[PDB]
């Protein structure tokens, strides 16, 4: 069975959501059932508040074999309220075996108010070099920038 | 400067050109000066000899910065003399910091007899997912089987 795992812990769910308890989105490298009908649950998915300027998830490959993240596309739709969305780890990288937080910011600008489209275009890839899990294709998130 | 190194050992190019020394082909980052007019280099590479079934590459990424390599086609020509090239490492992973030998066989099937063409095409990536080094394009390698 797969390794792969990532997820929101619970304490950052309760900030963004409510309901203090970890949101399971792959697990033994397999995508949660909740985003296998990508749309309908984007539609459950509202605008990240004005309150949060970062967001922490959680991932590990807890097994012995190797996986590749690559981040293809951190990019905001508008520019002129929201810069593009950070991560802090390098764009290219090893899946770590031991649980470690990757933060994505979405960084306001200020110089303006409303709600910023954009993509976090993300593959993970196997030893063979093959696209095992990805951003469901043309997804959009939203941030309310003040 | 770079930290990437790729050669072949002064033991191993004794038994394929004669002379025992070190092939530099990456040279802190940089591809030897041999490689830039490659189709010059080319003519000066004979089609491997029946005697050699497999040839060692050594490489390191010698500081601190990661390196990704993947080799993106291990494919014979001529299938009918030899079967696709074969490395003893997996197709997408990290270069090591320690320096390392990559095998690259060259199985001649024995079903028949000649010259086999076949690629090694890889790349190495930096941890902003850019390709750094690769194969020039269109490189063409030869194999003798008998
Ligand atoms: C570090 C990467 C972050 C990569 C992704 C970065 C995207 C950055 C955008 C952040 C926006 C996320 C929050 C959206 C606003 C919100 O409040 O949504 C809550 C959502 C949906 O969760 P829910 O509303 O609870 O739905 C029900 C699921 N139950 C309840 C059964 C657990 O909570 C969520 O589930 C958010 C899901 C966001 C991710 C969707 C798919 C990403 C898949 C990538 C797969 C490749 C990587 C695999 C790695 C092993
Ligand atoms: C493990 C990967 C092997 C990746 C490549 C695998 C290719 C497998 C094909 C093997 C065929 C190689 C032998 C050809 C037959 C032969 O006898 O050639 C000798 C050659 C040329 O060397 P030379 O004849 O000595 O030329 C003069 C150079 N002086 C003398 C100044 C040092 O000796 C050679 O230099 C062989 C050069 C073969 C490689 C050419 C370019 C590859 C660049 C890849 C860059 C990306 C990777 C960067 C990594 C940090
Ligand atoms: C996100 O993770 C960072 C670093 O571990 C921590 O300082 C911060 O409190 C976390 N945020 C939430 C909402 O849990
Ligand atoms: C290639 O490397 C292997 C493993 O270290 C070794 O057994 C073999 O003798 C090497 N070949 C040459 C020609 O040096």
């Given at each position: 069975?797969?390794?792969?795992?990532?997820?929101?812990?619970?304490?950052?769910?309760?900030?963004?959501?409510?309901?203090?308890?970890?949101?399971?989105?792959?697990?033994?490298?397999?995508?949660?059932?909740?985003?296998?009908?990508?749309?309908?649950?984007?539609?459950?998915?509202?605008?990240?508040?004005?309150?949060?300027?970062?967001?922490?998830?959680?991932?590990?490959?807890?097994?012995?074999?190797?996986?590749?993240?690559?981040?293809?596309?951190?990019?905001?739709?508008?520019?002129?309220?929201?810069?593009?969305?950070?991560?802090?780890?390098?764009?290219?990288?090893?899946?770590p075996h031991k649980?470690?937080?990757?933060?994505?910011?979405?960084?306001?600008?200020?110089?303006?108010?409303?709600?910023?489209?954009?993509?976090?275009?993300?593959?993970?890839?196997?030893?063979?070099?093959?696209?095992?899990?990805?951003?469901?294709?043309?997804?959009?998130?939203?941030?309310?920038?003040?």
């Amino acid at each position: 069975t797969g390794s792969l795992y990532l997820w929101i812990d619970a304490h950052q769910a309760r900030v963004l959501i409510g309901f203090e308890e970890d949101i399971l989105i792959v697990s033994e490298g397999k995508m949660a059932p909740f985003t296998h009908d990508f749309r309908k649950a984007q539609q459950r998915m509202p605008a990240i508040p004005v309150n949060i300027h970062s967001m922490n998830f959680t991932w590990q490959a807890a097994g012995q074999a190797e996986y590749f993240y690559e981040f293809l596309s951190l990019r905001s739709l508008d520019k002129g309220i929201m810069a593009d969305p950070t991560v802090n780890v390098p764009l290219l990288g090893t899946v770590p075996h031991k649980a470690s937080v990757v933060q994505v910011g979405f960084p306001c600008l200020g110089k303006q108010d409303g709600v910023a489209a954009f993509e976090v275009d993300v593959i993970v890839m196997n030893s063979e070099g093959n696209t095992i899990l990805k951003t469901p294709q043309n997804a959009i998130f939203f941030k309310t920038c003040q």
